[PDB]
């Protein structure tokens, strides 16, 4: 009854550094389709079981989505750190959310490489939970004043992915959607 398809089942997914939020509420959610579609190869879902949540209902059904390299799909988790976890996306601990991921090499991979999916890998500071920061500001590496030129002392924080069909099993791109059901203390709360 509410937009579960339009977030999963579409064509354009933004890169990691500027991932998209999608708030879904004021509906009745039919999770029966998210059970046995046989395509979600990593439906790993923490905190609250999917089976008997139909009795439960609360607001704030925040849903995020993006595309991420295949091997580092494991790195996305509560409290687990690494390359992507420490710099771009970090799921808060004491989680109550629930993650979904699947392979989509059939359509999001073309000959010559799809150089449209960038990502950040340097950052002086770290990330607060459930936060996203986007800025293409360059870094002055050394003592040479840099205006807009690229060189030994001027660095671009974002780096480009290379997606290939012939490439290895762990290198083919995966798509991820993360749900996070949170609620508040105020009563008379809308259900779902």
């Amino acid at each position, epitope marked *: 009854l509410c937009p579960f398809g339009e977030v999963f089942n579409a064509t354009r997914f933004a890169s990691v550094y500027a991932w998209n939020r999608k708030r879904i509420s004021n509906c009745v959610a039919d999770y029966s389709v998210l059970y046995n579609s046989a395509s979600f*190869s990593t*439906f*790993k*879902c923490y*905190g*609250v*079981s*999917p089976t008997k949540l139909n009795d439960l209902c609360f607001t704030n059904v925040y849903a995020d989505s993006f595309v991420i390299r295949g091997d580092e799909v*494991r790195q996305i988790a509560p409290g687990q750190t690494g390359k992507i976890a420490d710099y771009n996306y970090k799921l808060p601990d004491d989680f*109550t959310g629930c993650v979904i991921a699947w392979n989509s090499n059939n359509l999001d991979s073309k000959v010559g490489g799809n150089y449209n999916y960038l990502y950040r890998l340097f950052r002086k500071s770290n990330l607060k939970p459930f936060e996203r920061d986007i800025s293409t500001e360059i870094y002055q590496a050394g003592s040479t004043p840099c205006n807009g030129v690229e060189g030994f002392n001027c660095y671009f924080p974002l780096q480009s992915y290379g997606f290939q069909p012939t490439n290895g099993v762990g290198y083919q791109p995966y798509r991820v959607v993360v749900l996070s059901f949170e609620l508040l203390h105020a009563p008379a709360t809308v259900c779902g």
Partner: antibody
Amino acid sequence: TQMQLVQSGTEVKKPGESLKISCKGSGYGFITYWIGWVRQMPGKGLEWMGIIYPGDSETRYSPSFQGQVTISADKSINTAYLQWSSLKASDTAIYYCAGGSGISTPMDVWGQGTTVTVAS
Amino acid sequence: DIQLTQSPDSLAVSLGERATINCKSSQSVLYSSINKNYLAWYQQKPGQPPKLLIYWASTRESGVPDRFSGSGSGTDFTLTISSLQAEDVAVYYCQQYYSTPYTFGQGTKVEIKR
């Protein structure tokens, strides 16, 4: 059923050797099922051994049981395997594989349990 | 880690009254975002694999009789079977799942007094 679980049969081996048992599932919705192991000594209560995810083989061990048992997973046939490197006198008990959909969620679906003893 | 205790360790009451068991823990088992206590209550008839009755410490699993109930808060919890019958003799168990690891109690046995 919602989920069906089967295990191995009887197990009688001399102490010290290795052992390999398997808990295998069948049904619809298996992909969300963490698999844990529960042990029962004859005439006593229960104690957890270890939990695992069949898909990417993410394991968690009880603090008092680390390093004594081996847990493995196989996603092609959706099975969870337990391996013993050394068999001792305290390895004569009953075992159960318990399914649970998520962490901090109950172990609701259970197998029939397998028995392990050692004698002549 | 969390350790669990049961009270009483042995029990025996006649047919047709209320049976009460208590499970006591150490750390608070109330979650931050969700206001539901993380306890489960199991039963096990001898010679059979254990079969859950109560999940999330305040609900009833599908397919079980409605003559069962639970209560409690903080770190102490109660289980009450109303009008126990002859076929309800078993060994019961309490188990928390606030965080890894989980551990059950020693165990309680129920008998029909006469």
